[PDB]
């Protein structure tokens, strides 16, 4: 589920509460969060707690400004997961 929502999320002139990763060493296995932030490296000449060349911070920001176009609006997204096990299903609707 995804729906357009800037009337709630785009503080005028820009929202800065929303960050996402851009640089990570590995592609992300399915269904894991990776909260921790550190510094990235670029080829050789690596970094350690320092910033600049070959160095980056992983968390960018969204400038959610209402003046933006449709292509850059915020979207509130919620996803659901269902599965069939031997276990009693416990969440449905009929059950009589």
């Amino acid at each position, epitope marked *: 589920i995804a729906w357009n929502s800037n009337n709630l999320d785009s*503080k005028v*002139g820009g929202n*800065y*509460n929303y*960050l996402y990763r851009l640089f990570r060493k590995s592609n992300l296995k399915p269904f894991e969060r990776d909260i921790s932030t550190e510094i990235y490296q670029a080829g050789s000449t690596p970094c350690n*707690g320092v910033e600049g060349f070959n160095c980056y*911070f992983p*968390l960018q920001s969204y400038g959610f400004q209402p003046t933006n176009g449709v292509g850059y609006q915020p979207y509130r997204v919620v996803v659901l997961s269902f599965e069939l096990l031997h276990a009693p299903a416990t969440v449905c609707g009929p059950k009589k």
Partner: antibody
Amino acid sequence: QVQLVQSGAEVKKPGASVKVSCKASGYTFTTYAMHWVRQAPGQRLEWMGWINAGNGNTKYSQKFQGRVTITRDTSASTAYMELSSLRSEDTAVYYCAGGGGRRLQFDYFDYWGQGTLVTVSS
Amino acid sequence: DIQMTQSPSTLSASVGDRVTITCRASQSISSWLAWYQQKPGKAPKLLIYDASSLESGVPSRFSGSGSGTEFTLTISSLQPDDFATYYCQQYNGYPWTFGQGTKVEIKR
């Protein structure tokens, strides 16, 4: 409990430049939220700006466009600010705050420093 | 910019009573507000954020309400610990302003 402490009282002169500074006491540094505000003596609080204690982001106010700057020191994990081209109206009390801590960023003031006194006189 | 005026400017009360506070916005707000307490010669307290939520560490008297434009603050009983001003803050949009200020005194 997270605590914020800063420098003392501090008397400057029109045209000069001034630097106030506060050390943080954070259980986590999860893109901490240094976020300054001002208070002219007993009148409206008017808002200073926010530095990104996470990496480097420096979002400032319009009325103080072009003359105020902020940074932070990481291993000291303190945050500093200039405040430049001072003037008589500029006399006030100066507040560190922020410290979202749980979440990554907010826009509310939940951990205040207990205040800095700046007097611009001739 | 986001306009903010609050009423009434000053109010009256006595210990063990309810006092209403109304924060007035000129222009539409989506439950974007915080309520702060201000003792003289002090650094501010927060106790409502988000126009409803009660943040931890506070007496349970405090309760926000309202949405849209009219915003309201509520306390059931009046401790001496309540004798200070109270400020409302918007965070719908940019540069974030404050209110005017709303103090209680001691009426007799």
